[PDB]
């Protein structure tokens, strides 16, 4: 996105587009760390069973220590994952 | 090209006279935008007399429709069965009304 449509599309065009993709990453991390800050106070809450109907173990997708490692995954994935759209299109 | 279509005149009172504008052909009035003048040319109308005669016919037709409406409620009101003849209604409306309509028009 932030390469070809931006203000410096008609020129620093991909350096311009690079760290701007690295940004919505870090804000999502605030959004997802702040999303997590409110919700989980005591234990998880999901549809426990499968389609088969037997009581399977509950997922850590929804928990106190859950969304933390996701919010971390969204950061380290995002920031690094951004760098490789401008090591391949630029460098 | 050089006359503005007009078919309304104002009476001379209360300054409304000014509404009778310079519309051409030596006539003073309100310029119409209904598009009747062109209909009339398309229908082949040439003189006013013809317009008068068409007008009187429409008035008779108005009388006939009013008569029809009183009749089909107060003397001879059709039965539910009647109104439900959808196939017949559809056929007659498609073929008589639209069909014979545009046919005779095309005449």
């Amino acid at each position: 996105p932030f390469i070809k449509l931006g203000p410096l599309r008609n020129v620093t065009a991909e350096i311009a587009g690079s760290l701007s993709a690295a940004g919505l990453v870090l804000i999502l991390a605030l959004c997802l760390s702040i999303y997590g800050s409110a919700q989980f106070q005591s234990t998880p809450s999901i549809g426990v069973k499968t389609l088969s109907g037997r009581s399977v173990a509950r997922d850590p997708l929804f928990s106190a220590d859950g969304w933390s490692e996701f919010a971390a995954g969204f950061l380290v994935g995002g920031e690094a994952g951004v760098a490789w759209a401008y090591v391949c299109t630029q460098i | 090209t050089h006359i503005k279509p007009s078919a309304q005149v104002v009476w001379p009172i209360v300054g409304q006279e000014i509404l009778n504008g310079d519309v051409g052909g030596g006539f003073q009035g309100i310029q119409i935008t209904s598009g009747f003048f062109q209909l009339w040319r398309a229908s082949g109308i040439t003189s006013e007399l013809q317009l008068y005669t068409t007008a009187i016919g429409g008035l008779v037709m108005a009388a006939a429709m009013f008569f029809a409406g009183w009749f089909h409620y107060h003397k001879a009101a059709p039965k539910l069965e009647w109104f439900q003849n959808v196939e017949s209604m559809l056929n007659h409306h498609l073929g008589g009304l639209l069909g014979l309509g545009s046919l005779a028009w095309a005449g």
Binding site: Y35, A38, Q39, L61 | V14, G15, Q16, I18
Partner: protein
């Protein structure tokens, strides 16, 4: 257990409403959990401090940026041909030619033109350099911090005042009348004498030397002697140039009247004497209520004594002491009423008698101000009438006010409401009737058939004031009148000279176009007061709903049954009343704007001839003076009126959203949301996210406020963009 900390009831709300109300409930003390009279008064007091601290910080902010980013010094040297800088702009969104465009004045980047009249204010008071602005900015910031301090200070149990102290009304009245009004105006007069007057005479007097500089040659000899006339011995000459020695006198206190001819503002000597004079009346009068000395009046006794014979006013004012001293909303109603009147008072006297040097030469500033204070006055008035009924509901004691002026007021309220209705319908019918009549005659090309009533009564008043145009020869017009002969050798020469200069705003010329618009404004007044008064008096009970007082000040309705009860609450009455506020002051501000615009333009005959019909307003006011505005950009290029035109459309867009929230109501939107909340919950991936706060439609009362807010903001912003862009 959750925020709202102050409400269990709202805190247990499972939805997004909890949030909204929480924001909305924040300042309503009486409605919070476990509240007492003590906590009420104390929180109110602290809140007052808080307000003051925000005000002083705000004022300091202005001074700060004028000093730091403005061209204050370029203005003083040349006030006539320099556009006063408010602030610098650093906008990363601007394009190349935008940055060029907004670089006005002597600025090294983009700048905005001040239309606040703070320049002429300052400048007239004595402010000369950026340094002065900086020192004032520091001071007032210090006062802001001090006020904040003070707020938390009387929060501690040692410094917590008692309710008895809050109820000591006599003391507060004495102190405010003598000290806050008397002393502070005396001290100002001190500032005018010591700093402003010398500054206008071209002698820069500062903290470092005032004490060493004589304002008068034989100073403080007249004062004690009783030879006060010496203070008025030699005023500034008619050829005096402001801020310079040339033509300057030595007098410090005069009654000259009229204006300083080059600046066209009131004489700082007159202003000095004015502030001093009022100061004395305040100081003497502020020793009137009884406190800790035994000498003074009883409020209660005065009020209870004033009951006329043969019970034409019932029990008179018996019981009003208690119902006022108890009721806080009553005090806020009186306060807001008076404040609203004086706000318009200020607006109407300031324009016709401008007090600042080289104001009134600034068109845009004047227009901006006069619109400002009339809208502020309107809102303040609606608010006065909004704590009117809050009294009527929550506070009134029917037994304790038995047969008083207040209870008797409630008694014949149908008469009051119905007669206001008459007065508004009369005006509405006739004024509109005479305008639309005037338009039809204009349309048919017969303007000679117009109904143009000449305002004989105002033209009479102007004559009594000394304008000679109309040739009635009354009072200050007629040379053979005691009123003339008395003060002819006092100030009337300055006065009469000013009233009859028709290039100034002082008692403008009046014709039939003035006549119609004032009755439009009267329609404005009477109808808004109809809504507000009706809302106040029927806040307690009606025939449709006798138990309304059990519900309170804002409620959606009382159901669809027995006819339907939408917009039944006094809340909603005030809501309805705001729209007339808006419309009425809309009319007044237009009236104002045009009648000046045509004066400045040099053709008053444009106004007199087109103000007699409404197309005239549409064509010659609205259509003409937006020409430049709407051009701020086009497909070809751009100019400096970008922001106003942007904001013009911004205001319109705000204005139409408001219509959305006003017209369409809840049931649609909730069911909309109802399908959306299913939609989310069976959308995969998105499934993994769920809300904490259940999504719900805004309330009725919420919809009511949110519409009103958008409407008002759009109103104000749109006009402001128009007013400024056109006048500039």
């Amino acid at each position: 257990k959750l925020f709202p900390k102050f409400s269990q009831g709202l805190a247990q709300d499972p939805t997004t409403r909890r949030i909204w109300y929480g924001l909305a409930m924040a300042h309503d003390f009486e409605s919070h959990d476990g509240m007492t009279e003590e906590n009420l008064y104390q929180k109110i007091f602290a809140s007052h401090f808080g307000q003051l601290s925000i005000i002083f910080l705000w004022t300091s902010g202005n001074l700060f940026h004028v000093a730091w980013q403005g061209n204050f010094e370029q203005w003083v040297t040349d006030p006539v041909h320099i556009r006063p800088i408010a602030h610098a702009i650093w906008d990363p969104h601007f394009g190349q030619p935008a940055v060029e465009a907004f670089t006005r004045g002597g600025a090294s980047g983009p700048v905005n033109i001040s239309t606040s009249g703070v320049y002429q204010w300052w400048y007239t008071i004595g402010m000369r350099t950026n340094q002065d602005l900086y020192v004032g900015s520091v001071f007032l910031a210090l006062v802001s911090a001090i006020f904040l301090f003070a707020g938390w200070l009387h929060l501690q149990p040692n410094f917590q005042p008692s309710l008895s102290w809050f109820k000591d009304a006599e003391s507060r009245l004495n102190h405010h009348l003598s000290g806050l009004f008397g002393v502070s105006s005396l001290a100002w007069t001190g500032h005018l004498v010591h700093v402003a007057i010398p500054e206008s005479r071209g002698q820069h007097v500062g903290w470092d030397n005032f004490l060493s500089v004589l304002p008068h040659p034989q100073g403080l000899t007249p004062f004690f002697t009783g030879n006060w006339a010496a203070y008025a011995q030699s005023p500034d000459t008619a050829s005096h140039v402001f801020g310079t020695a040339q033509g300057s006198g030595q007098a410090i206190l005069t009654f000259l009247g009229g204006f300083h001819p080059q600046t066209q503002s009131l004489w700082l000597t007159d202003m000095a004497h004015h502030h001093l004079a009022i100061a004395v009346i305040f100081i003497v009068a502020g020793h009137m209520y009884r406190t800790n000395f035994g000498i003074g009046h009883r409020m209660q006794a005065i009020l209870e004594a004033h009951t006329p014979p043969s019970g034409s006013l019932g029990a008179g004012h018996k019981g009003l002491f208690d119902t006022v001293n108890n009721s806080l909303h009553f005090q806020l109603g009186l306060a807001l009423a008076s404040v609203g009147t004086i706000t318009s008072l200020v607006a109407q006297h300031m324009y016709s008698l401008p007090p600042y040097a080289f104001q009134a030469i600034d068109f845009t500033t004047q227009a901006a101000l006069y619109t400002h204070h009339q809208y502020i006055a309107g809102f303040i008035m609606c608010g006065a009438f909004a704590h009117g009924a809050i009294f009527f509901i929550r506070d009134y004691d029917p037994e304790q006010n038995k047969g008083n002026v207040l209870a008797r007021m409630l008694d014949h309220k149908e008469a009051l409401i119905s007669h206001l209705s008459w007065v508004s319908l009369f005006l509405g019918f006739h004024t509109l009737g005479l305008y639309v009549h005037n338009d039809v005659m204009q349309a048919f090309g017969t303007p000679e058939k117009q109904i143009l009533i000449e305002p004989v009564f105002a033209q009479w008043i102007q004559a009594a004031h000394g304008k000679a145009l109309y040739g009635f020869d009354f009072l200050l017009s007629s040379k053979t009148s005691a009123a003339f002969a008395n003060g002819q050798s006092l100030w009337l020469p300055g006065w009469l000279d000013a009233i009859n200069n028709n290039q100034n705003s002082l008692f403008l010329t009046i014709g039939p176009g003035d006549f119609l618009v004032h009755h439009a404004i009267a329609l404005g007044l009477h109808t808004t007061t109809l809504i507000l008064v009706k809302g106040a008096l029927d806040a307690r009970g009606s025939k449709l709903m006798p138990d309304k007082k059990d519900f309170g000040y804002s409620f959606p309705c009382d159901g669809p049954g027995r006819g339907g009860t939408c917009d039944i609450s006094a809340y909603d009455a005030f809501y309805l009343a705001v729209f007339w506020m808006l419309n009425t002051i809309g009319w007044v501000t237009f009236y104002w704007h045009w009648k000046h615009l045509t004066l400045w333009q040099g053709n008053v005959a444009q106004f007199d001839e087109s103000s007699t019909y409404l197309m005239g307003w549409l064509r010659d006011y609205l259509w003409l003076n937006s020409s430049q505005l709407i051009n701020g950009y086009n497909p070809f290029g751009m100019n400096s009126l970008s922001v106003w035109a942007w904001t013009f459309l911004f205001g319109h867009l705000i204005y139409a959203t408001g219509f959305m929230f006003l017209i369409s109501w809840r049931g649609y939107w909730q069911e909309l949301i109802e399908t959306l909340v299913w939609a989310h919950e069976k959308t995969p991936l998105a499934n993994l996210v769920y809300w904490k706060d259940k999504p719900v439609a805004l309330s009725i009362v919420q919809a009511r406020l949110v519409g009103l807010a958008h409407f008002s903001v759009g109103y104000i912003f749109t006009y402001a963009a128009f007013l400024i862009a056109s006048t500039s």
